[PDB]
Amino acid sequence: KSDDVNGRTKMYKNIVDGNHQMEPGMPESFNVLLKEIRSLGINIELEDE
Amino acid sequence: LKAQTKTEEFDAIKIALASPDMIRSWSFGEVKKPETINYRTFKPERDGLFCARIFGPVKDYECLCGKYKRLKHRGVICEKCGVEVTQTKVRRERMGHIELASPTAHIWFLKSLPSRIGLLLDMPLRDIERVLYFESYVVIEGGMTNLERQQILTEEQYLDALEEFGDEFDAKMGAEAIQALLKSMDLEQECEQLREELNETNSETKRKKLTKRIKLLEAFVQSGNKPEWMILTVLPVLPPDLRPLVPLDGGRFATSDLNDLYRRVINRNNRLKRLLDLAAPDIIVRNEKRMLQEAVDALLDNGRRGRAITGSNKRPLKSLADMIKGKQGRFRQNLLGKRVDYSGRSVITVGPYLRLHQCGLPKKMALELFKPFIYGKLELRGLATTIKAAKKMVEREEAVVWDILDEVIREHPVLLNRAPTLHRLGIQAFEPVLIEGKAIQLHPLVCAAYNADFDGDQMAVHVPLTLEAQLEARALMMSTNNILSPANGEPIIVPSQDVVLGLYYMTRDCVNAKGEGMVLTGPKEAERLYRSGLASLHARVKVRITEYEKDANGELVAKTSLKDTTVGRAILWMIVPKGLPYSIVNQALGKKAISKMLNTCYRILGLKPTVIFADQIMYTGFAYAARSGASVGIDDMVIPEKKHEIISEAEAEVAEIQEQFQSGLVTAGERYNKVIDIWAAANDRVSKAMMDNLQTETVINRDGQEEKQVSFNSIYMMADSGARGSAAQIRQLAGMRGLMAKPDGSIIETPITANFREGLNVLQYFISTHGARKGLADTALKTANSGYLTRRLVDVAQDLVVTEDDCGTHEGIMMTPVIEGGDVKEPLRDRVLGRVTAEDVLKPGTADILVPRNTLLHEQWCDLLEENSVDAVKVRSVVSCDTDFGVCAHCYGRDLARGHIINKGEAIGVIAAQSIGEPGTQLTMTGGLPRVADLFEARRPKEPAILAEISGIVSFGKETKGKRRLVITPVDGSDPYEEMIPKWRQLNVFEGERVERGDVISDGPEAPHDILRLRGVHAVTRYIVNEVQDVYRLQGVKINDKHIEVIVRQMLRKATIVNAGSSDFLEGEQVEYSRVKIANRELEANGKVGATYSRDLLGITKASLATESFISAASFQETTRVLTEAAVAGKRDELRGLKENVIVGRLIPAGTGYAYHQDRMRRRAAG
Amino acid sequence: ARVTVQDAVEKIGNRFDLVLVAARRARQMQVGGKDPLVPEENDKTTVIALREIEEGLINNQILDVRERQEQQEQEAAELQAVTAIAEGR
Amino acid sequence: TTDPVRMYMREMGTVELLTREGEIDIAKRIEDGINQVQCSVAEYPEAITYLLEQYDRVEAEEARLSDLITGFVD
Ligand SMILES: [Mg+2]
Ligand SMILES: [Mg+2]
Ligand SMILES: [Zn+2]
Ligand SMILES: [Zn+2]
């Protein structure tokens, strides 16, 4: 409903298709926080699977 | 099976230092130029902070030079300007770098309060700065000569030292030196060195500081980080679109402050690169290096130096640390908190016609909100060819869409919210009802839970889009599913004011009225009597009634009798379902009884009958209240006839006491208090005169001579019923109002003799002003105090969730009634209700199991205990629950908006914290709200008492040295205790007595640290709950003791080891970890030993400090310090908590998500 | 409409596992895969699934059971097609 | 004391100002220094032959008069 720039459009199409679901993905606010931390000298990774 | 490579759904996160090569991995190019955009054609200059080659196309799927403009071309790098044509989105992603000529220090590892680089090298900070500014030379790897490895020299001294030893000794200065040190440092060799020295020299001064360093170092070793990386070779650059240059209206430009910062670092860096090939003298390249060092620092975190200011604007330019940082922690997650689509708001109104499960929604609001749904339903039935045509239809507002909206609206809850969301009922789900008009209509019964008055308050609406959100709203957040406060089990849907004046005026009786004495077959013909005008609403009448009792085994018995009642109660009986007795409605039905009515209906027949019941009560309440024609006139407020006389007599007393002060019979101070008391006493007299007159003086006649009953006077009915007003507020209307207090707080010895029914003159009003303004100020401030408190509370709890079912511990706390000094300030039945028994309880006699071991005590069980004389009950509590990392459902209790035992996975910490914080508005400014905080902050009082440290005979030793030592001597055990207590504090302790450990050795308050330490866990938790509950209950606030217990459990989460064999002896650590670990030794490895710990008491704000997840800590703590302190250890956040999962935007590992995380958490550590 | 979900919560204790199960079911109907087990009053799939829980014809076991049957019902059709992937050999 | 303005003002404040004659002292040394390398350069045979090979490229239109000499001593 707010921050997922992909998920929002992917959602809207499902609402008209008649499918109530969400393919959420990751919020862009937090996705930016990764770059701001990484823009400093900090290596921040998402591990595993 | 193959692992993976590309994007899977990730779990956990890792953080660490970045190698120069690691930084180069991310970088898609070197920013070599300060240039941004061309200045005419506004295109980005290759290769500068904004670059198509390094970062990305300005516009979607189009080459910069324009050679490849076709959407087909994707992996194509233009031969003219290398730009791979791809969405402009990558200009928000791709990073860059800058290769620094000279190394540069990272201010965060330099300037976070414990300078990391300093204590990593065991080197002072001021010295390192002295080495960085080229203000002295420092040795590295001194060899066998004259000099320490870390020793610092000055210019001349370095020269003097150099003539003697040219080589086999080395010293540098500036950043390269520090980097050489970090590189030369061998942690492994140093670690061993540190291990010996701990054992060799035995001193607390020595080994205290000593041990701190060695664990830290080896943490860094096991981490995988190499010390050199605290010194920057390569500097990453943030993607351009995250610091955009975007144009504005009038053709002006606007840009992020980072550009000005980045540009600077570049210029200086580049200038320095030039100055190397020109072989400039040392004095300049040195100055250039310092300037570059300062510039990088200003970029990363500005303000740890001089605080550079942005160009032409006084205001300092915002750096990267300030982008993350804020108030408080992150802005992202701080309130507020992200804007959200599909929402709205407007002024709210009543709508009593509504059922309790629905709410009035304005026509246009619903249109704009469901816009995507309407499009889809419109094109599902074929009323619109395509979505575009559908858009035009609702934009045309063709009449046909309204029927389609009723379809898409029908089963589709909406979320309603008010401004200060406090407890979870601050948000509730409703079913939409289409309303002409722009106002939100809100079911009256809920106005209490929202604290929503109608004085123009606005509410916000949210649409639950995903199917899971619709079902969450309906089965959890629905209005009808929460009618009972989670704070205390009492219904929060209790009819409010207008309704209870209706029911109070309805079931009430006068002495003589139409229909007096007659008899009727049943309520049906009772209404027939009333509605036709034959019988009065209140007249004494016997009517045949059929009540029901399910007292069989799950089965309804019926009984009919002639009940002596009135017409109104007879009429009202029509609503009461089935198994309730007529006894509940045979009374006068005040606001107090009308809630307990609803409570019993819920606890007997269940939810469904209770909901529809509540509805009916409201409808009939409003209706009959409207019939009643209740009003308020000026003659409705009756002043005592005896008032003026009382004032004069009390006016005579002051003149008695005054004559005594002029003649010196009484002192000045004594005068003030004396006069204040008589005036105060006078107020009570007037209050209790008008109360008597007002209440019963209606004196009326039935057939016989005279008689007198409780007044039907308008204003009284409001206060008696519980509708509005209270004897205190009434006292201000008719009787004199109070004695106000001057700002000083010294209540004035000439009270306010008038009231509101009379006029207040100039002085009285002016004096009244202070009470109002300080009231508003106090409350407006008490508003602020409350919010912060709930904050501290939810921070320390939060992540606490019901996890296991039964921890299976017999342990629990002993529950007795509170008995504060008089009679029963709170019964036993309220204290134990809904909790679970620790062990079976006996009758006063035995061989009788009343309650069998662990059983939920519900209403019948509490009454069966009350039938018997049962005086004391031990109860499982969340403080005693054996489950680690959570609460076992049995140890908590049943409480919810539903009466059933608490479900597995409900997040109780939040509902506990919210429940405690919300009522806090009503507390005072010892006593009051700050007193509560002192309890939760564990704060030691100013002049505490002292408790016997150990049992056994005590004596006094030595003599007044500013402290006179006290020696306790156990019979068998060791004697050695002698504590130095200042003797100028009054003792209590009998000098010659054996003291049980924990007795009162003096007077004054005691630190809760002691009670935990000396008296034990159950003692201190009993202490907190009873003291904090004293504060609330003094205000009339009902908060179940449960919630307070969970906060307590979080205060003592940590413990300090005593014995050894696997852990750190003196380490403070989670008793969760320890307890699971000593179970890992009792039968595992070596017994070893061990280890015994000691539970510790942490204040709420201190205990919330320690949190495993650093992303959570980075939210509410000081962000800079958290990231640094975490980045060095290479700490790996596994999520698992709530705070962090909200941040990353995935399912909360609780509630509906608890099934998910559980299913995923187990997938881990497997294969 | 469904005013109170209480009857379903009795059928499934947790009241959270209720939201999930009814959800899983509502999608079997909303995305057009199946049809209702109980008269639809024009109630949307949200409530239709809930009536199905109250009436005891839908729960986690049946769905896992039901789904597990469909796994083998479709696996029977493709039987010849995927055994034709002998192209591995 | 941080504030690089200060640690600059103080690092340079050590260097003492030149006398009107002292300016020439250093300057004479400069000429001497360069002339040594010039003479040192003049003594290299390949340095001569290369210039020859370079000037034949100038007269062959393989370079320009500006890319080799800025003019001589005369
Ligand atoms: Mg209100
Ligand atoms: Mg208001
Ligand atoms: Zn191009
Ligand atoms: Zn437990």
CATH code of residue B712: 1.10.132.30
Pairing label, strands B994-995, B1093-1095: unpaired
Q: How far apart (Å, rounded) are the C-alpha atoms in residues B152 and B321?
A: 32
Q: How far apart (Å, rounded) are the C-alpha atoms in residues B1047 and B319?
A: 38
3-state class (DSSP) for residue B875 = strand
CB contact under 8 A, D11 and B134: yes
Q: State the greatest distance between any 2 C-alpha atoms of chain A, in Å, as a whole number.
A: 46
Containing B318, the helix (H) or strand (E) segment is none
Q: How many Cβ pairs closer than 8 A exist between chain A and C?
A: 8
Nearest alpha-carbon partner for B719 in B623, B627, B630: B630
- The one-letter amino acid code at B546 reads T
Instruction: State the first-to-last Cα distance of chain A, in angstroms, to the nearest integer.
Output: 26
Q: How many Cβ pairs closer than 8 A exist between chain B and D?
A: 23
Report yes or no: B83 and B67 within 8 Å, Cβ to Cβ: no
Q: How far apart are the CA of B883 and the nearest CA of chain A, in angstroms?
A: 28
The edge-to-edge listing of strands for the beta sheet with B170-172 is B152-153, B137-140, B170-172
The edge-to-edge listing of strands for the beta sheet with B1093-1095 is B1068-1070, B1054-1057, B1093-1095
- Least CB-CB distance to C19: which of B357, B412, B471? B471
CB contacts of B470 in chain A (<8 Å) are 20
Category of B819 on φ-ψ map: left (φ > 0), alpha (ψ -120 to 50) or beta: left
Beta bridge partners, B431, equal: B358
In B, residues 410-449, which contact C (CB 8 Å cutoff)? 410-412, 431
Backbone angles phi, psi at B1111, to 5 degrees: -65, -35
Residue pointed to by tokens 């001589």 = D72
In B, residues 77-116, which contact D (CB 8 Å cutoff)? none
CB contact under 8 A, B1152 and C2: no
Q: Is B87 exposed, middle or buried (0-12, 13-18, 19+ CB in 10 A)?
A: middle
Q: How far apart (Å, rounded) are the C-alpha atoms in residues B1064 and B515?
A: 86
Experimental method, per PDB record: X-ray
Residue pointed to by tokens 């198994």 = B579
- Least CB-CB distance to D11: which of B129, B286, B294? B286
Q: How far apart are the CA of A10 and the nearest CA of chain C, in angstroms?
A: 16
**Residue D60 touches chain B, beta carbons under 8 Å:** no
Q: Which ligand is nearest to the CA of B447?
A: 1
Q: How far apart (Å, rounded) are the C-alpha atoms in residues C47 and B102?
A: 68
Beta bridge partners, B1093, equal: B1057
Beta bridge partners, B1002, equal: B987
Q: How far apart (Å, rounded) are the C-alpha atoms in residues B24 and A41?
A: 12
Q: How far apart are the CA of B343 and the nearest CA of chain C, in angstroms?
A: 21
Q: Nearest 5°: CA angle at B993, between B989 and B994?
A: 110
DSSP designation for B947: B
Residue pointed to by tokens 């307990």 = B596
Q: How far apart (Å, rounded) are the C-alpha atoms in residues C77 and C86?
A: 17
Centre of ligand 2 from the C-alpha of residue B913, in Å:
24
Q: Collect all residues with Cβ–Cβ distance below 8 Å to D21 and sequence separation of at least 6.
A: none
Mark B990-1025 as b/e (b = at least 16 C-beta within 10 Å): eeeeebeebbebbeeebbbbbbbbbbebbebbbbbb
Beta bridge partners, B434, equal: B361
User: Within B521-667, where are the H helices?
Assistant: 523-531, 567-572, 591-605, 607-628, 643-662
B601 annotated ligand-binding residue? no
**Residue B482 touches chain C, beta carbons under 8 Å:** no
Residue pointed to by tokens 């509605």 = B531
Mark B767-803 as b/e (b = at least 16 C-beta within 10 Å): bbebeeeeeeeeeeebeebbbebbbbbbbbbbbbbbb
Report yes or no: B800 and B887 within 8 Å, Cβ to Cβ: yes
- For B44-51, the CB contacts below 8 A with 24+ separation are B44/B240, B46/B81, B49/B237, B49/B240, B49/B259, B49/B262, B49/B263, B49/B266, B50/B240, B50/B245, B51/B96, B51/B240
Q: How far apart (Å, rounded) are the C-alpha atoms in residues C31 and C45?
A: 10
Q: Collect all residues with Cβ–Cβ distance below 8 Å to B1084 and sequence separation of at least 6.
A: none
Mark B710-729 as b/e (b = at least 16 C-beta within 10 Å): bbebbbbbbbbbbbebeeee
- Cα–Cα distances in angstroms (integers) from residue B1122 to residues A34, B9, B1116, C7, in the given order: 15, 26, 10, 48
Q: Do at least 3 CB pairs under 8 Å connect B with C? A: yes
- Cα–Cα distances in angstroms (integers) from residue B130 to residues B138, B289, B513, D7, in the given order: 9, 14, 99, 11
Backbone angles phi, psi at B801, to 5 degrees: -140, 150
- The one-letter amino acid code at B649 reads E
CB contacts of D3 in chain B (<8 Å) are 305-306
Q: How far apart (Å, rounded) are the C-alpha atoms in residues B448 and B490?
A: 13
Three-class DSSP labels, B275-310? HHHCCCCHHHHHHHHHHHHHHHHHHHCCCCCCCCEC
Q: Which ligand is nearest to the CA of B77?
A: 3
The edge-to-edge listing of strands for the beta sheet with B952-956 is B978-981, B964-969, B952-956, B994-995
Beta bridge partners, B186, equal: none
For residue B321 the two structure tokens come to 């640390």
In C, residues 38-77, which contact A (CB 8 Å cutoff)? none
B424-B426-B428-B430 Cα dihedral, nearest 10 degrees: 170
User: Within B168-303, where are the H helices?
Assistant: 175-184, 187-200, 204-223, 257-277, 282-300
CB contacts of C9 in chain B (<8 Å) are 475, 898, 900
Q: How far apart (Å, rounded) are the C-alpha atoms in residues B1056 and B325?
A: 33
Backbone angles phi, psi at B455, to 5 degrees: -75, 15
Q: Do at least 3 CB pairs under 8 Å connect D with A? A: no
Sheet strands (E) in B383-534 = 414-417, 427-435, 440-441, 458-462, 519-520
Task: Please give the residue range of the domain that contains residue B714.
Answer: 642-774
Nearest alpha-carbon partner for B588 in B597, B579, B599, B580: B597
CB contacts of B480 in chain C (<8 Å) are 3-4
Q: How far apart (Å, rounded) are the C-alpha atoms in residues B576 and B533?
A: 24
Q: How far apart (Å, rounded) are the C-alpha atoms in residues B782 and B759?
A: 32
3-state class (DSSP) for residue B519 = strand
CB contact under 8 A, D8 and B133: no
Chains that touch D (3 or more CB pairs under 8 A): B
Centre of ligand 4 from the C-alpha of residue B890, in Å:
6
CB contacts of D4 in chain B (<8 Å) are 133, 287, 290-291, 294
DSSP designation for B902: P
CB contact under 8 A, B410 and C44: yes
Mark C39-70 as b/e (b = at least 16 C-beta within 10 Å): eeeebbbbbbbbbbbbeeebbeeeeeeeeeee
Nearest alpha-carbon partner for B837 in B853, B817, B813: B853
Category of B722 on φ-ψ map: left (φ > 0), alpha (ψ -120 to 50) or beta: left
DSSP designation for B722: T
CB contacts of C30 in chain A (<8 Å) are 18-20
B862 annotated ligand-binding residue? no
Report yes or no: B146 and B165 within 8 Å, Cβ to Cβ: yes
Q: Which ligand is nearest to the CA of B921?
A: 1
Report yes or no: B149 and B139 within 8 Å, Cβ to Cβ: yes
Q: Do at least 3 CB pairs under 8 Å connect B with D? A: yes
CB contacts of C31 in chain A (<8 Å) are 18-19, 21
CB atoms within 10 A of CB B655: 10
B191 annotated ligand-binding residue? no
Report yes or no: B320 and B132 within 8 Å, Cβ to Cβ: no
Category of B463 on φ-ψ map: left (φ > 0), alpha (ψ -120 to 50) or beta: beta
- Cα–Cα distances in angstroms (integers) from residue B435 to residues B441, B474, D31, in the given order: 8, 21, 97
Nearest alpha-carbon partner for B19 in B174, B226, B182: B226
B359 annotated ligand-binding residue? no
CB contact under 8 A, B611 and C27: no
- Cα–Cα distances in angstroms (integers) from residue B1055 to residues B44, B888, B1093, in the given order: 59, 21, 6
For residue B557 the two structure tokens come to 């018995």
Report yes or no: B591 and B502 within 8 Å, Cβ to Cβ: no
Report yes or no: B936 and B1028 within 8 Å, Cβ to Cβ: yes
The edge-to-edge listing of strands for the beta sheet with B1132-1133 is A42-45, B13-17, B1132-1133
Three-class DSSP labels, B908-938? HHHHHHHHHHHHHHHCCCCCCHHHHHHHHCC
Q: How far apart (Å, rounded) are the C-alpha atoms in residues B307 and B1105?
A: 29
Beta bridge partners, B491, equal: B484
- The one-letter amino acid code at B942 reads K
Q: What is the CATH number of domain C1-89?
A: 3.90.940.10
User: Within B697-726, where are the H helices?
Assistant: 714-721
